[PDB]
Every structure is written in C-alpha cells, then in structure tokens.
C-alpha cells in the first residue's frame, strides 16, 4: 500500500527531528568543554548585555549561569550565576553575582563542606584596569557548601555586588559585553 510509504516517511521524519536535537545538544556540549577550566579559575564572557539586561527587567530571564569550572581534573565542579538586574537587596539597583557548587561526579572523594576561598569579580576593559571584586570564606554551616544532593546547591555571593549605574557608566562594558571572573583557592587543600 501507499500507507506503507507514508508510514516510512513519517518514521524517517520523526528520527530526522531527533537527530537535529542530538546535534544541537552536542554543539552546546562542545562549547561547554571548549570553555572548561581545571585550575579553579573562571573567566565568564557575557555578550549582548543590553538585550540580556532588558530581559532581566522584563522578567524573561532573571539570571544566567557560567559554564562549569573545576579546582582540578577530578575536583569540585562549580559555576557562577548572575542577575543582570539584581536579586534580593540589590534587585533593580545592582548586579548580583553568586558562586554555585554543582554535584560533581567525584564528590564521594572530595572534602565537605566546601572550604576553599572564593573571589568574585567583574573585569574593567578600560586601559586603567580598575577591576571590581570581593572574596569570602565559605560558611561551614551554609547549605551552599555541603555535599551536593541535587544538580546544584544554593547560590551564595553578593546581591549588592555593583550598582547598576556604576557598572553602566564605567569602562566595564565594551562592545556590548562584560567579563566575570571567579577565583577559587586550591593551593590550600590536599591535592590528588
């Protein structure tokens, strides 16, 4: 019958669809890898600041995540979260920057809770290089630094990192893009 030809076409179309997602996913997966780091330092590049800022305001997209980064080849898996329009006490007024601990595939061998010092910062692209940053020492009793249970733990950082004005007036933005850098202390910890 022709119902056979059409069924076969349908089968193919269905699979071609799947293949497309599989492909798209891998493009994403490539990207993540190509930008991975294993020395506990993250350099997160955020293009389209205007549009993304606007989507934060419009409530379309409140926050953004960096690709994951590591303290070592088989160490903690972490990342960053930013709210272009602020969160909490900085909401609407500042840019909030947080640190996140993700469920690593080797947590069973890592020390908990997380105790490595974290240094959050936004880079200045102007030639005077007056970067903005602040560091902290994980709070042992905080549920953000315990052995992950779900994919990610509660983000912990600075809700009032930078005043949105300061950000948008200084030389931090250039070519509609900003750079965020995280520095996790690794030296102080028995390495593999």
């Amino acid at each position: 019958n022709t119902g056979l030809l059409e069924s076969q076409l349908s089968r193919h179309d269905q699979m071609l669809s799947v293949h497309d997602i599989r492909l798209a996913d891998m493009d994403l997966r490539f990207q993540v890898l190509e930008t991975a780091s294993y020395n506990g330092v993250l350099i997160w590049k955020i293009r389209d600041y205007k549009r993304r800022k606007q989507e934060a305001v419009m409530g379309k997209t409140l926050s953004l995540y960096s690709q994951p980064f590591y303290t070592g080849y088989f160490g903690y898996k972490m990342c960053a979260r930013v709210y272009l329009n602020g969160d909490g006490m900085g909401k609407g007024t500042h840019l909030s920057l947080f640190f996140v601990i993700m469920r690593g595939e080797y947590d069973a061998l890592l020390p908990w809770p997380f105790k490595q010092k974290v240094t959050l910062m936004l880079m200045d692209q102007g030639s005077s290089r007056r970067h903005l940053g602040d560091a902290f020492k994980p709070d042992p009793n905080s549920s953000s630094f315990k052995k992950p249970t779900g994919e990610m733990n509660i983000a912990s950082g600075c809700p009032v990192f930078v005043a949105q004005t300061v950000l948008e007036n200084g030389t931090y933005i250039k070519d509609d893009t900003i750079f965020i850098k995280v520095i996790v202390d690794t030296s102080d910890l028995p390495d593999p």
Partner: peptide, 7 residues
C-alpha cells in the same frame, strides 16, 4: 556570603 532568592 549571602544567598540568592530561592528561584
């Protein structure tokens, strides 16, 4: 170290 709203 301050935490983010639940979301």
């Amino acid at each position: 170290p301050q935490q983010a709203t639940d979301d």
